[PDB]
Design a binder for this molecule. Sequence first.
Ligand SMILES: Nc1ncnc2c1ncn2[C@@H]1O[C@H](COP(=O)(O)OP(=O)(O)OP(O)(O)=S)[C@@H](O)[C@H]1O
Ligand SMILES: Nc1ncnc2c1ncn2[C@@H]1O[C@H](COP(=O)(O)OP(=O)(O)OP(O)(O)=S)[C@@H](O)[C@H]1O
Ligand SMILES: [Mg+2]
Ligand SMILES: [Mg+2]
Lengths: 452, 192, 494
Amino acid sequence: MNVTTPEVAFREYQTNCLASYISADPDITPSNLILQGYSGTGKTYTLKKYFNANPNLHAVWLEPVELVSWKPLLQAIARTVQYKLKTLYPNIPTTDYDPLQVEEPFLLVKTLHNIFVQYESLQEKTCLFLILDGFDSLQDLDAALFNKYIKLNELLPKDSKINIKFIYTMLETSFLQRYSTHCIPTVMFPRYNVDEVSTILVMSRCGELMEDSCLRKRIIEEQITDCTDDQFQNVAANFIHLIVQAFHSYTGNDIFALNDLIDFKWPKYVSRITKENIFEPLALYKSAIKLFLSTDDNLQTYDLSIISKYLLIASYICSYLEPRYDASIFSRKTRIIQGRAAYGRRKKKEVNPRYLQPSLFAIERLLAIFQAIFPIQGSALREESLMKANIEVFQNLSELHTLKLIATTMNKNIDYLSPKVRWKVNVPWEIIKEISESVHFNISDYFSDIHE
Amino acid sequence: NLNRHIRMNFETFRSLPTLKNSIIPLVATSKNFGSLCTAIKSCSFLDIYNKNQLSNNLTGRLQSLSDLELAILISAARVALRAKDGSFNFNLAYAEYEKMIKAINSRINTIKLWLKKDVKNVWENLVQLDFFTEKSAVGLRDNATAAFYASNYQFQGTMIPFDLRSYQMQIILQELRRIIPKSNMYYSWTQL
Amino acid sequence: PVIRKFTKKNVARAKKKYTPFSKRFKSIAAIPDLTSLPEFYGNSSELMASRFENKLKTTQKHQIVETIFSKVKKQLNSSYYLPARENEFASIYLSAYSAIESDSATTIYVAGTPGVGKTLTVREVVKELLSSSAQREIPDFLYVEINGLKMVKPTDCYETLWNKVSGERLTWAASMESLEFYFKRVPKNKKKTIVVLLDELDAMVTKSQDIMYNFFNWTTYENAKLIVIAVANTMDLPERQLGNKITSRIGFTRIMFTGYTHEELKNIIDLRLKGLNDSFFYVDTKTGNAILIDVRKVRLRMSADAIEIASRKVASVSGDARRALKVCKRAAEIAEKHYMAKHGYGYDGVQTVHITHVMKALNETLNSHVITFMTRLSFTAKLFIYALLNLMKKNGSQEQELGDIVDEIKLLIEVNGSNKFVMEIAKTLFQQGSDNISEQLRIISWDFVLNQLLDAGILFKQTMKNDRICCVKLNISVEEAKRAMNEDETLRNL
DNA sequence: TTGAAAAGCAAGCATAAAAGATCTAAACATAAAATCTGTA
DNA sequence: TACAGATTTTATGTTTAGATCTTTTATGCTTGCTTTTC
Ligand SMILES: Nc1ncnc2c1ncn2[C@@H]1O[C@H](COP(=O)(O)OP(=O)(O)OP(O)(O)=S)[C@@H](O)[C@H]1O
Ligand SMILES: Nc1ncnc2c1ncn2[C@@H]1O[C@H](COP(=O)(O)OP(=O)(O)OP(O)(O)=S)[C@@H](O)[C@H]1O
Ligand SMILES: [Mg+2]
Ligand SMILES: [Mg+2]
């Protein structure tokens, strides 16, 4: 009609649809509009560019993620509408309505009607665009809020000189499919290819990278570099292409992850360069091969006491082993009365039980196995060689529980003294292996037999 | 072509507003009268509109995945097929993935075997894109009071460590076999 | 000042006092005569109606045309001589008259089913009692009517009663003590009998039996002069609420209102149409205006067979009277519409109503509109219903999984790939007719038909975020869906 | 060897227990209209 | 000897602590058979 289409790199059809839908005439424009696309797909960029290309259109920007409920959303709408309407027309006398009076959806309609009544001296009907950018990111969200904002456009006056139109930007598809019967116009933003991501990443972080101080320092510490600008841009583009080709299979088609890796691996690659390969990309690639294989995106493992160290191992053994075969593993003393031990297992399990959720046990079994596996204590008629469960053992067990290294049947205000309470473990195999190896214990021998 | 599109809408949607929404950009996009005449004669814009409207459904995401993500998805589906109730977790999926990679390498350039800490990011990316769901989790509550009640209770899924959360599948293996083209090198592994 | 943790900026509070009545006139011996006070018993307050009336008034009438059937429609509403209810009238009137004459207190309980006419006969009894009192035969009294569904909070009864007997405006608790003191300790020489009409009683006792117990107990006191009449749906409601011993102590009167029969209903309908039926009217041909006794002379007749069949049908199922009146009114309206349509009239021989009009108006309330709704649905929705029925005919579980429905739809499409219609519909169903769209996984227009069926009240789906194991079930039984599917052709054939 | 005994395995089954949906009441908190209390 | 002051009465909103019921999976008894000790 009478609108200008901006030029976006890989969003031609979306830009055409946007220019087709929204305009300055309230007679020809939809009351609602949804833009859908997953994270890092290029919707806010396109919308902002479109509004920056046409200065006549009026718009108010919100972000319903800082606001974490519906009452703050209503109050924010009622405040921003007043602020924008006041800053645009300054010659219309007006009163002030407190936004905090808006507490219910009906009160929002009443306040909006009262606000819109005053500006009835204008010449021709206009339209005010309210962009709820991020409607799906509300923390406490239910399937009823959208049904109110859809129908909010019918209780407002029909012949006023100020018309309000909504625009949402939604992330998921499962949420959007719930309201498919309403037949609201939609423009969908599909995800990117790899070539498009590479070109966008170059176009964005090419110019900014070169004014960094590190490369300036590295070249003032080095000799002259003629054709400075073109060579510098080529070096930057080569680095971006190398990092993309190296970590595409790990970052996916995610602009943000690659944009973080590029910043992570820049200060060292610029240090590895030198004059004899500043114009030789291949030799420079060989000289900096270390920072292209391991991502390295990370920041004794524990400092527990001796008895807690063995207590964790005993709890792991209790949780990931079957009671019926216990006697065959720990019986190590002679007999006076005639008796026989347990025969033991006849076939090995083929599931490697450490891949499954831990089972539940009892405190008595834990204490028994802890006594069994504890190292011997450093005229033997009064020796008492075996370790006994004194106060500090129970204290350390409570300390282990309160550190979330041991769980129980989870309910509010547990009572530790009741037969109906059972425990289990919350550490993976790596932590328990490190703990066992840090105190010279061969835990794997207990698990190798069932399955390596 | 207009009659054919009308008949398709009649047999599939049967609703005027959908056709109206389809037609609006067709008449609002053309710049010259000849362009409008040829667009209404050919109706080639409606095909583009329909193609876009299906560009984020279940089969529209599967064609925008890297090799490692596709391999992890295939491995997870294979693991979930054997289970009784379809549940699985990270460790079983990685074990199947490493077995499949070793078999591919031994059959025959060598395919790199990514480590556990690098597959964690791919797992999180896949669970974000709505390919897996937790074991038995409801989605969005019907009204506000139910959501308020549910927001004050700590579910047991957020206390179990990362390696033992039980997920469930949203795309069965047969659908992967139907969709994935036969030229892919993972195609032979999409059936048991 | 201080920082508030939250704010309430839309609080509105009425101006009502807190001090009860048993603090005003000091000692009991200092209480004056309450009959002669200008504020008590509504002695001088008759201007509340004029406060808000005359607002909904305007000055124009463009000679509104009144067709023949307009009189019948007007004289058949539920607002315009009791023919059947006489024993209940006699019992209630005798009890109330005996209570008023001897200056005592009493409680009458009336229980019935909707539409019998209990409120009408109670109001008629009250009117007759008022006329008799104005005839100077019994001491004068006051009539206060309290409803149960016309109050926002259930505890708004108390103050209302007080506001109707004293002119004060107090809160509910202070009203409770004020009423207690007034009914207990004020001497009988300085009062006046009061006739309360507690109505829709079951809507007050929903959290506790306080209101019912107080209102029933105030009739026990000797100094009180209260006559309570309470109507309700269930008969043995107080027993389920108060208790057997308290009810035995109170000792009220009980009345049950049975439903109507097919003779009393016909008598009511015939009585409501006496002057109009079989009369003569002057009718202007140009416009259509009708005047009760160029122009024509016509008659209006209503066949007694139509009235009899309407009464027989209505009385058989419910026993109402409102529904019978509305059925007759709707038949008259249909006849009027046909008459104006044929004669080409507009707004601003012997014309009768046949049994056909009454039957047509009667069929509109008994029939259901589900079979017709499904016999016009889209092809995809019918395919969905067919797949659900097929899965139910195999598992017999009444609650199916959604992925099973999808797989059944795919199998049905791929196994009948030799019928012309399904042979040429496959491309439009899976790729929407274009060669640039990849083969879809579920169907074109899946969520649309799913939500269309779920909104209309045909499917029930439990809430789970996994969209492959969600369970759905029917809600219209199974024979209706079978009939709807059988009425089709392409689904019937395959 | 020697089978009698204990130990081990498996199928069919009942029954306790975990995980979460739906709800109630106490503790913590704000506010307008009516009463109470020193002194002009 | 009031009246501006402080205190009480009637009326709802905001967050935490605990209880009861329903659906689905795990735990233990029984019955029949057989390897392992000794
Ligand atoms: N078509 C494009 N042309 C050029 N640069 C682009 C394009 N799309 C994205 N970018 C760049 O990549 C960035 C990605 O951020 P956005 O596109 O704003 O993400 P987004 O889609 O708003 O993400 P959400 O949905 O808000 S998490 C942009 O800020 C630009 O720097
Ligand atoms: N004997 C009768 N004579 C004439 N009209 C009657 C008779 N009995 C009932 N009605 C009609 O019944 C209509 C409804 O009033 P009621 O029957 O008194 O209502 P109700 O019994 O209070 O119903 P509820 O409130 O649902 S229990 C009246 O307007 C009359 O037209
Ligand atoms: Mg954004
Ligand atoms: Mg009534």
